[PDB]
Design a protein around this nucleic acid. Structure first.
Length: 424
DNA sequence: ATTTATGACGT
DNA sequence: ACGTCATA
């Protein structure tokens, strides 16, 4: 009577260093070279936000200043994010992301998780594929970039090991040693190979993927073998996988709650959670978190793949660090106008493309000396896709935040978000 | 001065 | 409504 969280087949697809691949498709000179994408070149060469795998090998990471990355990797090539109205403009990447998600939707139900990753619900697609091929062995040739986590168990080249693990898996499927859920995952992986082939053929982009029974395991699986590969994590693989898996690697446990789990229970690995009762976990972390942890450490999670190919919000913001912090009224107004103009453009395009209208405008700011990402959030009605009205409306709602033709304390961040979409 | 985005939850 | 958390 003990449920095993084996009801669904779920994938998570992550475009490998996505902004970089976009620039590399556009500029063949960047292909197969150590390359990074930077925004804002003046200050320390700019901030790196995406890094090719060739560059990662030199120790280049995101959130590194380009000048610093050049010390680690002198031959590093850089592509700059487009800058419009004095701020980074991510339109090219948003549009490329749409290219990929449109291809994914042909194969299965997708949840847009971010600009560069999507969850995929393959349960239905797997059931249908299982009827078309019935009692036919699944050839290793259908899974040319698939790793089976945990295998092989029992040749000094990675590709050799991959194939040996796959053979062991498939030989035990064909034997009848594995379970029907295992067959379901395997077929799911075949479909993902097919989806990933179609993405590469049609866009030129490569991606890694994880296939498992829920989103957390799929996300975890995806990161196990990168770039351009996919990993199947079976329910059976979970005890060994979790036995040495730091708690912070599991999605949603990378922050404060994860650190609390570690500190309060005196443990380090995900698997160690199984020794606590559900009541115990709830007593420390709350009813929801405790229940979630109890199921998750056993490889079980029920968060559905939401059928949502489009972002629920459309926002833009700009930080104004250090000396650049906004300190006059005219300056604060000029930047609201810049933000509002980008937002109007993206909103109008959204309306035309997606048949919806935003109804709420959220204004957020951060004041100098406040550690919290947001110092304050206020909303007002968004009635007109008009940059001047939007910027003026936003000024109105945050104007009282100023102590006193001058602005103090200085603003270190402005954020306009369009939310609350309705069909149009 | 590691951005500029996102989605979710608690109250 | 508003603040906080988590992710890349």
């Amino acid at each position: 009577h003990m449920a095993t969280g084996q009801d669904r087949v779920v994938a998570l697809v992550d475009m490998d260093c996505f902004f970089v691949q976009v620039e590399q498709r556009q500029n063949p000179h960047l292909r197969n070279k150590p390359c990074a994408v930077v925004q804002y070149k003046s200050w320390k060469g700019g901030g790196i936000i995406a890094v090719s795998y060739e560059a990662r090998a030199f120790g280049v990471t995101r959130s590194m200043w380009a000048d610093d990355a050049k010390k680690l990797c002198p031959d590093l090539l850089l592509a700059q994010v487009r800058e419009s109205r004095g701020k980074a403009n991510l339109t090219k990447y948003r549009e490329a992301s749409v290219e990929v998600m449109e291809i994914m939707s042909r194969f299965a139900v997708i949840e847009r998780a971010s600009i560069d990753e999507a969850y995929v619900d393959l349960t239905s697609a797997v059931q249908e594929r299982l009827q078309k091929l019935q009692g036919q062995p699944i050839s290793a040739d259908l899974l040319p970039s698939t790793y089976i986590e945990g295998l092989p168990q029992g040749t000094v080249q990675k590709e050799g090991m991959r194939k040996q693990g796959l053979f062991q898996w498939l030989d035990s499927l064909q034997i009848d040693n594995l379970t029907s859920p295992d067959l379901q995952l395997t077929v799911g992986a075949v479909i993902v190979e097919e989806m990933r082939a179609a993405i590469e053929r049609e866009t030129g982009f490569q991606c890694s993927a994880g296939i498992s029974h829920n989103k957390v395991l799929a996300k975890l699986a995806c990161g196990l073998n990168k770039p351009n590969r996919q990993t199947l994590v079976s329910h059976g693989s979970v005890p060994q996988l979790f036995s040495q898996m730091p708690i912070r690697k599991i999605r949603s446990l990378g922050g404060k709650l994860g650190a609390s789990v570690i500190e309060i229970l005196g443990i380090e690995y995900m698997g160690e959670l199984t020794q606590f009762t559900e009541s115990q976990l709830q007593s420390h972390f709350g009813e929801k978190n405790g229940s979630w942890l109890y199921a998750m450490c056993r490889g079980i999670e029920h968060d559905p793949v939401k059928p949502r190919q489009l972002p629920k919000t459309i926002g833009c913001s700009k930080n104004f660090p250090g000396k650049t912090a906004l300190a006059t009224r005219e300056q604060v107004q000029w930047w609201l106008l810049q933000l509002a103009q980008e937002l109007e453009e993206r909103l109008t395009k959204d309306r035309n493309d997606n048949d919806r209208v935003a109804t709420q405008l959220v204004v957020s700011i951060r004041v100098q000396g406040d550690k919290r990402l947001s110092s304050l959030r206020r909303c007002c009605a968004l009635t007109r896709y008009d940059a001047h009205k939007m910027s003026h409306d936003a000024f109105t709602v945050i104007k009282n935040c100023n102590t006193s033709t001058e602005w103090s304390p200085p603003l270190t961040m402005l954020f306009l978000c369009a939310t609350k979409f309705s069909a149009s």
